[PDB]
Write an enzyme that holds these catalytic residues in place. Sequence first.
Site, PDB file in Angstrom:
ATOM      1  N   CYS A  69       4.173   1.105   9.283  1.00  0.00           N
ATOM      2  CA  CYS A  69       4.006   0.003   8.351  1.00  0.00           C
ATOM      3  C   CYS A  69       5.341  -0.400   7.755  1.00  0.00           C
ATOM      4  O   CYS A  69       6.201   0.443   7.480  1.00  0.00           O
ATOM      5  CB  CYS A  69       3.029   0.382   7.243  1.00  0.00           C
ATOM      6  SG  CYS A  69       1.382   0.367   7.965  1.00  0.00           S
TER       7      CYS A  69
ATOM      8  N   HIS B  78       0.792  -1.222   0.000  1.00  0.00           N
ATOM      9  CA  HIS B  78       0.000   0.000   0.000  1.00  0.00           C
ATOM     10  C   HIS B  78       0.828   1.277   0.000  1.00  0.00           C
ATOM     11  O   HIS B  78       0.245   2.377  -0.012  1.00  0.00           O
ATOM     12  CB  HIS B  78      -1.007   0.013   1.155  1.00  0.00           C
ATOM     13  CG  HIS B  78      -0.433   0.171   2.531  1.00  0.00           C
ATOM     14  ND1 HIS B  78      -0.323  -0.889   3.405  1.00  0.00           N
ATOM     15  CD2 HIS B  78      -0.045   1.272   3.224  1.00  0.00           C
ATOM     16  CE1 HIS B  78       0.123  -0.456   4.572  1.00  0.00           C
ATOM     17  NE2 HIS B  78       0.298   0.851   4.492  1.00  0.00           N
TER      18      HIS B  78
ATOM     19  N   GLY C 297       3.158   5.662  10.071  1.00  0.00           N
ATOM     20  CA  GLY C 297       4.518   5.544   9.591  1.00  0.00           C
ATOM     21  C   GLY C 297       5.221   4.270   9.987  1.00  0.00           C
ATOM     22  O   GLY C 297       6.365   4.062   9.562  1.00  0.00           O
TER      23      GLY C 297
HETATM   24  C1  LIG Z   1       0.999   2.142   7.968  1.00  0.00           C
HETATM   25  O1  LIG Z   1       1.957   2.827   8.690  1.00  0.00           O
HETATM   26  C2  LIG Z   1      -0.329   2.335   8.810  1.00  0.00           C
HETATM   27  C3  LIG Z   1      -0.134   1.849  10.380  1.00  0.00           C
HETATM   28  C4  LIG Z   1      -1.372   2.135  11.276  1.00  0.00           C
HETATM   29  C5  LIG Z   1      -1.544   3.653  11.455  1.00  0.00           C
HETATM   30  C6  LIG Z   1      -1.716   3.926  12.944  1.00  0.00           C
HETATM   31  N1  LIG Z   1      -1.414   2.652  13.608  1.00  0.00           N
HETATM   32  C7  LIG Z   1      -1.209   1.618  12.707  1.00  0.00           C
HETATM   33  O2  LIG Z   1      -0.945   0.490  13.074  1.00  0.00           O
HETATM   34  N2  LIG Z   1      -1.336   1.607   8.177  1.00  0.00           N
HETATM   35  C8  LIG Z   1      -2.530   2.153   7.758  1.00  0.00           C
HETATM   36  O3  LIG Z   1      -2.721   3.351   7.963  1.00  0.00           O
HETATM   37  C9  LIG Z   1      -3.641   1.275   7.055  1.00  0.00           C
HETATM   38  C10 LIG Z   1      -3.509   1.375   5.510  1.00  0.00           C
HETATM   39  C11 LIG Z   1      -4.419   0.439   4.727  1.00  0.00           C
HETATM   40  C12 LIG Z   1      -4.289   0.570   3.196  1.00  0.00           C
HETATM   41  C13 LIG Z   1      -4.243  -1.040   5.121  1.00  0.00           C
HETATM   42  N3  LIG Z   1      -4.962   1.721   7.530  1.00  0.00           N
HETATM   43  C14 LIG Z   1      -5.231   1.728   8.919  1.00  0.00           C
HETATM   44  O4  LIG Z   1      -4.456   1.216   9.704  1.00  0.00           O
HETATM   45  O5  LIG Z   1      -6.411   2.317   9.363  1.00  0.00           O
HETATM   46  C15 LIG Z   1      -6.644   2.403  10.814  1.00  0.00           C
HETATM   47  C16 LIG Z   1      -6.048   3.670  11.477  1.00  0.00           C
HETATM   48  C17 LIG Z   1      -6.232   4.002  12.841  1.00  0.00           C
HETATM   49  C18 LIG Z   1      -5.677   5.156  13.422  1.00  0.00           C
HETATM   50  C19 LIG Z   1      -4.907   6.029  12.675  1.00  0.00           C
HETATM   51  C20 LIG Z   1      -4.701   5.713  11.332  1.00  0.00           C
HETATM   52  C21 LIG Z   1      -5.266   4.568  10.754  1.00  0.00           C
END
Ligand SMILES: *[C@H](O)[C@H](C[C@@H]1CCNC1=O)NC(=O)[C@H](CC(C)C)NC(=O)OCc1ccccc1
EC number: 3.4.19.12
Lengths: 296, 299
Positions: free
Chosen positions: A141, A37, A139
């Site tokens: 991921c 992603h 950040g």
């Molecule tokens: C990649 O770094 C990120 C890690 C999440 C962000 C906050 N804590 C984590 O573990 N992944 C994503 O943002 C993910 C992307 C999709 C295309 C799979 N979406 C996600 O995790 O949504 C939930 C979320 C909760 C709180 C803040 C931001 C996102």
Amino acid sequence: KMAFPSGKVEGCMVQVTCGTTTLNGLWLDDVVYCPRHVICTSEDMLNPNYEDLLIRKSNHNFLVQAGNVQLRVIGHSMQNCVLKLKVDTANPKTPKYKFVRIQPGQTFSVLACYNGSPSGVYQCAMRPNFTIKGSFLNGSCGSVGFNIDYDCVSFCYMHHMELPTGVHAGTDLEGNFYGPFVDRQTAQAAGTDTTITVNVLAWLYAAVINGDRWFLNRFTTTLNDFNLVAMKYNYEPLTQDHVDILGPLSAQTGIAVLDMCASLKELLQNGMNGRTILGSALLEDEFTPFDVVRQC
Amino acid sequence: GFRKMAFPSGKVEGCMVQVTCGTTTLNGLWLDDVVYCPRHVICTSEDMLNPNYEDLLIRKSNHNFLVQAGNVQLRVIGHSMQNCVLKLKVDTANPKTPKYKFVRIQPGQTFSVLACYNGSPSGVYQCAMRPNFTIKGSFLNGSCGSVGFNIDYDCVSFCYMHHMELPTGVHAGTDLEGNFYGPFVDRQTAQAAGTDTTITVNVLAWLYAAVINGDRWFLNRFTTTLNDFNLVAMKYNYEPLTQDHVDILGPLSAQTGIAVLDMCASLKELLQNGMNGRTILGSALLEDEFTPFDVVRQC
Ligand SMILES: *[C@H](O)[C@H](C[C@@H]1CCNC1=O)NC(=O)[C@H](CC(C)C)NC(=O)OCc1ccccc1
Ligand SMILES: *[C@H](O)[C@H](C[C@@H]1CCNC1=O)NC(=O)[C@H](CC(C)C)NC(=O)OCc1ccccc1
């Protein structure tokens, strides 16, 4: 709760950026692995067509950096939910390594990284519902989870997302999610969680090794009778592999696995009657039989 | 989410070596052309019971010290003793030496421990310097010379070297100048520590962590003065809270909108009534080995 030393993995972390989207990648030999992603825009993440998204991408759209030093990408491919980026330089810090897929209940260390830089290391267990209780921010991921056996790093987890309940989900290093999740910014829910019975049993053995053994009884049970009762308490059933990995602790204590199970069963059915085990009224389920042996 | 998180240990892994003298083997820290290790490596069976270290040391030569870095022996070309640590000058500088400093931490501060055996890293975990100057570690035979450390930017601040286990199972050691934390001595004799207390400012920091992670059944509408809180705290063998502590909690107060003294009111209710089967961040006890900085960093 002890992590593996992270140095061998620190020497493999890089950052990967597409446009303004930056996450972490893992540089082993001349390949960088990261969550697919990274090729998503904000609005692509709502529901992405990863195949179409990648067709529009070329080697020259991927910025891979170790520190601030750029690493030239010479090829790219998608394997399930991970991007593989061939680079022109073999990582001189590549350790001996393996990619493994772990079972629920197994533990691993997580090297939490931001912008390719490690921030901390902690020990995690994969829950029966295929989430982990991580500590991950935006950040993070592409952070990886790993075990180290002898000199060899077994990479088992790459981080992709946070669920509504605050727990975390991701893939193995072949891009296959643990559990039923998908890399889409959509509403997803983990199954109800359960207690990791094999680990609780390991903990009871640890308590015996340290002289705390009031809970041992003179009874035994069949594995099937135990499994049927355990599920009534939201404990996982035991597998044959679980019985086997308890072997060394059984041998060290002389207490048969099925006798320890009869002891746990009595604890489930009668409670702790106010007493404690290893200085606690709660049974711990994130120490595997391997973890107990390590610290003992 | 929330987890006891250690600093990444790569910078320290590159400094660990094995040190041997006689039948005694432990770990050393190789910075530039010096290896630091606990001085009791020069002791025998008889000696550890009541060692006169200056006497034992003058009877040693450089070639009584075997240092191994991986498969490679380093030759010792000098040795001195600074309090309870031995400094071995070697003829090779460690290329992996990080930017570093030696610091003495205060009780309540936390640090990461890289546990090592025979010069090889085995695990890393987070500890705090207890108020009674012990640390609740996981150290086995052969772990002496293991170090504790913090990392700021690219700089490693070494604060602890491991020397012993007390009969209660807690651990004792020195700063990197060789001065013990606490009233302990590097002799093989049973030693007790003073009565420990709970690090109050860290309990508060961890209650704020629990609120950031949406766990808040313990909050209340009561309030309290700083001094009336400290009276109760001391009654329960908790450290007093200073105004510096209250200030240090500010960012966490700001983030959550919960004033420090209101959080003190919550903690006071927990001390007097307990948790009645409930749990915070998954614990049935109040955790006191997260500092305010540890909480901020991770959240
Ligand atoms: C990649 O770094 C990120 C890690 C999440 C962000 C906050 N804590 C984590 O573990 N992944 C994503 O943002 C993910 C992307 C999709 C295309 C799979 N979406 C996600 O995790 O949504 C939930 C979320 C909760 C709180 C803040 C931001 C996102
Ligand atoms: C140095 O490796 C060693 C570490 C102890 C051994 C068990 N766990 C530890 O943390 N330090 C000592 O053995 C120390 C030496 C004195 C001369 C300072 N003595 C000691 O700690 O005695 C307690 C002990 C308990 C259990 C096994 C062995 C020793």
